[PDB]
Scaffold this active site. Structure first.
Site, PDB file in Angstrom:
ATOM      1  N   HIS A  48       0.821  -1.209   0.000  1.00  0.00           N
ATOM      2  CA  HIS A  48       0.000   0.000   0.000  1.00  0.00           C
ATOM      3  C   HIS A  48       0.858   1.262   0.000  1.00  0.00           C
ATOM      4  O   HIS A  48       2.035   1.200   0.245  1.00  0.00           O
ATOM      5  CB  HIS A  48      -0.961   0.017   1.183  1.00  0.00           C
ATOM      6  CG  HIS A  48      -2.076  -0.962   1.062  1.00  0.00           C
ATOM      7  ND1 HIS A  48      -3.397  -0.607   1.226  1.00  0.00           N
ATOM      8  CD2 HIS A  48      -2.068  -2.288   0.800  1.00  0.00           C
ATOM      9  CE1 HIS A  48      -4.156  -1.675   1.064  1.00  0.00           C
ATOM     10  NE2 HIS A  48      -3.372  -2.709   0.808  1.00  0.00           N
ATOM     11  N   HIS A  63      -3.654   0.857  -2.718  1.00  0.00           N
ATOM     12  CA  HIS A  63      -2.521   0.145  -3.288  1.00  0.00           C
ATOM     13  C   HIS A  63      -1.545   1.111  -3.960  1.00  0.00           C
ATOM     14  O   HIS A  63      -1.948   2.054  -4.641  1.00  0.00           O
ATOM     15  CB  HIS A  63      -2.996  -0.903  -4.292  1.00  0.00           C
ATOM     16  CG  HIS A  63      -3.923  -1.927  -3.717  1.00  0.00           C
ATOM     17  ND1 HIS A  63      -4.556  -2.872  -4.491  1.00  0.00           N
ATOM     18  CD2 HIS A  63      -4.314  -2.161  -2.446  1.00  0.00           C
ATOM     19  CE1 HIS A  63      -5.292  -3.651  -3.722  1.00  0.00           C
ATOM     20  NE2 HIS A  63      -5.162  -3.243  -2.475  1.00  0.00           N
ATOM     21  N   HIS A  71      -6.610  -1.895 -10.803  1.00  0.00           N
ATOM     22  CA  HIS A  71      -6.164  -3.111 -10.119  1.00  0.00           C
ATOM     23  C   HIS A  71      -6.036  -4.282 -11.079  1.00  0.00           C
ATOM     24  O   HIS A  71      -6.806  -4.405 -12.026  1.00  0.00           O
ATOM     25  CB  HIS A  71      -7.128  -3.463  -8.997  1.00  0.00           C
ATOM     26  CG  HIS A  71      -6.697  -4.637  -8.185  1.00  0.00           C
ATOM     27  ND1 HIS A  71      -5.655  -4.579  -7.287  1.00  0.00           N
ATOM     28  CD2 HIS A  71      -7.166  -5.900  -8.125  1.00  0.00           C
ATOM     29  CE1 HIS A  71      -5.495  -5.754  -6.712  1.00  0.00           C
ATOM     30  NE2 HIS A  71      -6.398  -6.576  -7.207  1.00  0.00           N
ATOM     31  N   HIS A  80      -1.656  -2.055 -10.460  1.00  0.00           N
ATOM     32  CA  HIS A  80      -0.936  -1.195  -9.526  1.00  0.00           C
ATOM     33  C   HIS A  80       0.450  -1.772  -9.235  1.00  0.00           C
ATOM     34  O   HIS A  80       0.640  -2.975  -9.239  1.00  0.00           O
ATOM     35  CB  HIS A  80      -1.692  -1.080  -8.229  1.00  0.00           C
ATOM     36  CG  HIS A  80      -3.086  -0.579  -8.382  1.00  0.00           C
ATOM     37  ND1 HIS A  80      -4.145  -1.112  -7.680  1.00  0.00           N
ATOM     38  CD2 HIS A  80      -3.599   0.417  -9.138  1.00  0.00           C
ATOM     39  CE1 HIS A  80      -5.253  -0.468  -8.001  1.00  0.00           C
ATOM     40  NE2 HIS A  80      -4.949   0.469  -8.882  1.00  0.00           N
ATOM     41  N   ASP A  83       0.413  -4.593  -6.585  1.00  0.00           N
ATOM     42  CA  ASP A  83      -0.433  -5.779  -6.726  1.00  0.00           C
ATOM     43  C   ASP A  83       0.443  -7.005  -6.741  1.00  0.00           C
ATOM     44  O   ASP A  83       0.985  -7.363  -7.779  1.00  0.00           O
ATOM     45  CB  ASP A  83      -1.273  -5.731  -7.999  1.00  0.00           C
ATOM     46  CG  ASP A  83      -2.288  -4.615  -7.974  1.00  0.00           C
ATOM     47  OD1 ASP A  83      -2.482  -4.054  -6.898  1.00  0.00           O
ATOM     48  OD2 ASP A  83      -2.890  -4.273  -9.013  1.00  0.00           O
ATOM     49  N   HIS A 120      -4.775  -9.121   3.445  1.00  0.00           N
ATOM     50  CA  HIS A 120      -6.210  -8.867   3.512  1.00  0.00           C
ATOM     51  C   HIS A 120      -7.024 -10.084   3.958  1.00  0.00           C
ATOM     52  O   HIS A 120      -6.489 -11.196   4.058  1.00  0.00           O
ATOM     53  CB  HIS A 120      -6.718  -8.374   2.173  1.00  0.00           C
ATOM     54  CG  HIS A 120      -6.232  -7.015   1.816  1.00  0.00           C
ATOM     55  ND1 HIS A 120      -6.901  -5.869   2.181  1.00  0.00           N
ATOM     56  CD2 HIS A 120      -5.144  -6.614   1.122  1.00  0.00           C
ATOM     57  CE1 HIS A 120      -6.243  -4.816   1.732  1.00  0.00           C
ATOM     58  NE2 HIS A 120      -5.174  -5.241   1.087  1.00  0.00           N
TER      59      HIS A 120
HETATM   60 ZN    ZN Z   1      -4.286  -3.056  -6.629  1.00  0.00          ZN
END
Ligand code: ZN
Ligand code: ZN
Lengths: 153, 153
Positions: A48, A63, A71, A80, A83, A120
């Protein structure tokens, strides 16, 4: 040349972990992940924007996205920088895995030193989920743990 | 052209805090400190070498020292880059203070992003204590809390 960094993941749960990063020169970045306390299955794991942990894992922002794209999965063209895709937690709630990536350098303008790694709650849908959140968060759910990426020897 | 960073201090005790850093260009860095749960009195407050918090606050290493000098006070010439001196904790155990410093930039080779801030248990003797520890740690005792310096908006 060799640069190294580490992140200690903690959060509002029972998820804990360590992540080490290393790279040499313009080279890729090698990421070694070990996280415990996860629900078995797939989990979104992203780098992030911010190393801010004031207001829990939320202060870390979205992100990391220097190229202002949507994304995606790690292997996609459109994604990103942060990712890193999914992490798999085995039957004991432990995720160990080594990832390699091009878009998270430890030097230069796009350096991720001082930014955050977040694990996550749900599976990252890699953009292909056709949900409103698919093109921003991957619909990976809440934030289980995070840590600031700091320097090591 | 302003850069900003933050550090969230935690540790093996009852000391917690937030520290924010900002600088513009070659300028000095402004440091805003708010730490709670300290014993009233003076406390050593230093920027350490590594953002490693694997093995508690000990993994952060020694005082950040790019110029390979000995321990000193912030206003001395012979001092570690990380020597920010003492923080005063009031009768309620709270230390609020704003410092300015030259030797802890947020960019360039000597950047402190990804390193650690640590608040110590005892008074820093600023080098002038004529103890064996005086020229390395200031004899500031154990480590009460630390955090990695991370990026913010
Ligand atoms: Zn992302
Ligand atoms: Zn020192």
């Amino acid at each position: 040349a060799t640069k190294k960094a580490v992140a200690v993941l903690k959060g509002n749960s029972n998820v804990e972990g360590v992540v080490t990063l290393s790279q040499d020169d313009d080279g890729p970045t090698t990421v070694n992940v070990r996280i415990t306390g996860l629900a078995p299955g797939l989990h979104g794991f992203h780098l992030h924007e911010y190393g801010d942990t004031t207001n829990g894992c939320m202060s870390t922002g979205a992100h990391f996205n220097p190229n202002k794209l949507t994304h995606g999965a790690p292997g996609d063209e459109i994604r990103h920088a942060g990712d890193l895709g999914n992490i798999v937690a085995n039957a004991d709630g432990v995720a160990e895995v080594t990832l390699v990536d091009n878009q998270i350098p430890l030097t230069g303008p796009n350096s991720v030193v001082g930014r955050a790694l977040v694990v996550h709650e749900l599976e990252d849908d890699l953009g292909k989920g056709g949900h409103e959140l698919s093109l921003t968060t991957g619909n990976a759910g809440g934030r289980l743990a995070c840590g600031v990426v700091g320097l090591t020897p």
